[PDB]
């Protein structure tokens, strides 16, 4: 079963309940260490969808039909009882990214990558190569997705 | 009603956890060593999950039933600088730890809630720990029944 839910010009509406999906690994990139602005502030929490989690676990391959959201969230404080760090705050916004190739035959990875402008949005709005994949394909470790920094990826895997 | 989670041996030991990163989780934070005198208390992400059927009572109440499983993950910090900028990007996995609130078979632990250690993944059980171990800090300081659910987005946007 597929948990994208798409337009006919085969855009990604927004997606419903993807903190139950399954979570791969969280990053953070304050403001603070980026110039007072990070690209994308600044705790990001990873999820993929359920279908795309088993056949991973399967396969160690992305499926078509895979939809993977990063959740951002504000570093919130600095130090808690457990130390010194970056502790999450409100949440900010999502991006995503959709492997398919029937739908993106002439992408890279046919991955679509989407664009929020803000939680109420109906939909996502697909981005050109240059703003989001092209960094992807240049750097990530397993077909446009960063793998190494989903450590839930790679210990599934088989 | 939901499967319970976790199992448990006949003196009440929380078995190491299976399928957790299945879970529902909840949030992460991160104390990198660096940040902490070459040595955080947890090194160094922490990912945190609840068992998805107290995920489900806590959409519906806001509170944490008997049952509730919640599984804190441990993670390195792998790296400061990537792509996407400047900041804590994970490394491998440390460990586990882990709490249990149950009022029959805790009934005389603080917020009936047992707190278990783990020495290694192969382990085949925690260590169940002393209050002054664990509940003392999460009872002096969690905003929720000895939960840390200032940190815990999910939580805090789940519940009703
Ligand atoms: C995180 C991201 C994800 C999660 C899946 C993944 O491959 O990591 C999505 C869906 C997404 N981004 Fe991308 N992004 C970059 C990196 C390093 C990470 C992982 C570490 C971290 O969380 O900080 C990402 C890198 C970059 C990048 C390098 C210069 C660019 C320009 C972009 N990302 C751009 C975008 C998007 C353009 C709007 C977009 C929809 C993204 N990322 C989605
Ligand atoms: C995170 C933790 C969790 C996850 C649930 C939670 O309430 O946040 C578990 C299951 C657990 N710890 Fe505790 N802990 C502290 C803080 C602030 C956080 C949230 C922020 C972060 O992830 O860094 C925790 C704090 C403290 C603490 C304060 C001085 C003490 C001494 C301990 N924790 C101790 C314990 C454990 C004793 C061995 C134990 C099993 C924990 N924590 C479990």
Redesign the interface.
Same mark, same amino acid.
């Given at each position: 079963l597929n948990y994208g839910s798409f337009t006919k010009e085969h855009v990604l509406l927004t997606p419903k309940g993807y903190? +139950?999906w =399954?979570?791969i !690994?969280? #990053? =953070?990139?304050?403001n603070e260490? /980026?110039d007072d602005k990070?690209?994308?502030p600044? *705790?990001? /929490?990873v999820?993929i969808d359920p279908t795309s989690?088993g056949h991973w676990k399967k396969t160690g391959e992305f499926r078509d039909g895979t939809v993977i959201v990063k959740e951002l969230?504000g570093v !919130?404080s600095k130090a #808690? &009882?457990?130390? /010194? %760090?970056?502790? &999450?705050? +409100?949440?900010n916004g999502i991006a995503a990214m959709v492997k398919d190739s029937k739908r993106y035959p002439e992408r890279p990875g046919n991955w679509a990558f989407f664009g929020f402008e803000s939680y109420e949005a109906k939909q996502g709005i697909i981005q050109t190569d240059e703003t989001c994949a092209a960094?992807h394909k +240049?750097?990530a470790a397993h077909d446009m997705v *960063?793998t190494? *920094?989903y &450590? =839930?990826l790679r210990? %599934?895997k088989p």
């Open positions: 903190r +139950e =399954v979570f !690994g969280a #990053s =953070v990139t304050p260490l /980026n990070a690209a994308f600044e *705790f990001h /929490n999820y989690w969230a !919130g #808690s &009882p457990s130390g /010194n %760090g970056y502790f &999450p705050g +409100e949440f960094c +240049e750097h *960063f190494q *920094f &450590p =839930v210990a %599934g």
